[PDB]
């Protein structure tokens, strides 16, 4: 269940950063 | 827009990435959106790889039981464009790497219902002109 949490974390990070090398 | 439009969009997207040439007969507007999302999920994946050593594999062994927690967790603090693209790219990973390509099985329908309900339950269509 934790390993799942690592994924959501990695996805949130990439999601948030995507937002800027696409948000520009 | 229409909830049927978004249900149609998610199903068409999953079918396309599943190589499920068990086609459709949907419209031009749905197809250009599926295309944009396919392009975005690839650009997203590329960012994920540039930052991390591993890919999704390990965390999805039990996707049939945890997918909804992953999505809930993904949008626990905030909802934006990038995370919604991560939402679709996870789904694309399941069709491309986990499930069998070229055929629309019962697990695809499970993936589809899950993503369609979550996408709609959470008003994800409001953060997307992307």
Curated annotation (Swiss-Prot), chain A:
Positions of modified residues (Phosphothreonine): 14
- Renumbered to this chain, the signal peptide range is none
List the expressing tissues.
Ubiquitous.
Where in the cell is the protein located?
Cytoplasm; Golgi apparatus, trans-Golgi network membrane; Endosome membrane; Endoplasmic reticulum membrane
**Where is the motif (BH3)?**
3-22
Which superkingdom, per the lineage? Eukaryota
Modification after translation (UniProt)? Phosphorylation at Thr-14 by DAPK1 reduces its interaction with BCL2 and BCL2L1 and promotes induction of autophagy. In response to autophagic stimuli, phosphorylated at serine residues by AMPK in an ATG14-dependent manner, and this phosphorylation is critical for maximally efficient autophagy.
According to the UniProt record, what happens if one changes residue 7 to A? Weakly decreases interaction with MUHV-4 M11, greatly decreases interaction with BCL2L1 isoform Bcl-X(L)
Further information in the entry reads: Expanded poly-Gln tracts inhibit ATXN3-BECN1 interaction, decrease BECN1 levels and impair starvation-induced autophagy.
Self-association state and partner proteins as the record states: A homodimeric form is proposed to exist; this metastable form readily transits to ATG14- or UVRAG-containing complexes with BECN1:UVRAG being more stable than BECN1:ATG14. Component of the PI3K (PI3KC3/PI3K-III/class III phosphatidylinositol 3-kinase) complex the core of which is composed of the catalytic subunit PIK3C3, the regulatory subunit PIK3R4 and BECN1 associating with additional regulatory/auxiliary subunits to form alternative complex forms.
* Protein task: Plays a central role in autophagy. Acts as a core subunit of the PI3K complex that mediates formation of phosphatidylinositol 3-phosphate; different complex forms are believed to play a role in multiple membrane trafficking pathways: PI3KC3-C1 is involved in initiation of autophagosomes and PI3KC3-C2 in maturation of autophagosomes and endocytosis. Involved in regulation of degradative endocytic trafficking and required for the abscission step in cytokinesis, probably in the context of PI3KC3-C2. Essential for the formation of PI3KC3-C2 but not PI3KC3-C1 PI3K complex forms. Beclin-1-C 35 kDa localized to mitochondria can promote apoptosis; it induces the mitochondrial translocation of BAX and the release of proapoptotic factors.
Q: Which family does it belong to?
A: Belongs to the beclin family.
Record text about domains: The coiled coil domain can form antiparallel homodimers and mediates dimerization with the coiled coil domains of ATG14 or UVRAG involved in the formation of PI3K complexes. The C-terminal evolutionary conserved domain (ECD) contains poly-Gln-binding domains such as the ATXN3 poly-Gln motif, consistent with structural docking models revealing two highly scored poly-Gln-binding pockets in the ECD. As some binding is observed with BECN1 lacking the ECD, other domains of BECN1 may also interact with ATXN3.
Protein's name in the database: Beclin-1
Origin species, per record, is Homo sapiens (Human)
Taxonomic placement: Eukaryota, Metazoa, Chordata, Craniata, Vertebrata
Location of this fragment in the whole protein:
106 to 129 of 450
Swiss-Prot record, chain B:
GO terms (BP aspect): regulation of apoptotic process; symbiont-mediated suppression of host apoptosis; symbiont-mediated suppression of host autophagy
Q: Which first-to-last residue range defines the signal peptide? A: none
Places the protein is found = Host cytoplasm
One Gene Ontology term, aspect cellular component: host cell cytoplasm
* Keyword annotations from UniProtKB, A to Z: Disulfide bond, Host cytoplasm, Host-virus interaction, Inhibition of host apoptosis by viral BCL2-like protein, Inhibition of host autophagy by virus, Modulation of host cell apoptosis by virus
Lineage top rank: taxon: Viruses
**Known function:** Plays a role in the protection against apoptosis mediated by cytotoxic cells during the immune response to acute and persistent viral infection. Contributes therefore to latency establishment. Plays also a role in the inhibition of host starvation-induced autophagy which ultimately contributes to the viral chronic infection.
Subunit (UniProt): Interacts with host BECN1; this interaction inhibits host autophagy. Interacts with host BAK1 and BAX.
Q: What is the protein name given in its UniProt record?
A: Apoptosis regulator Bcl-2 homolog
Q: Which organism is it from?
A: Murid herpesvirus 4 (MuHV-4)
Q: Which gene produces this protein?
A: vBCL2
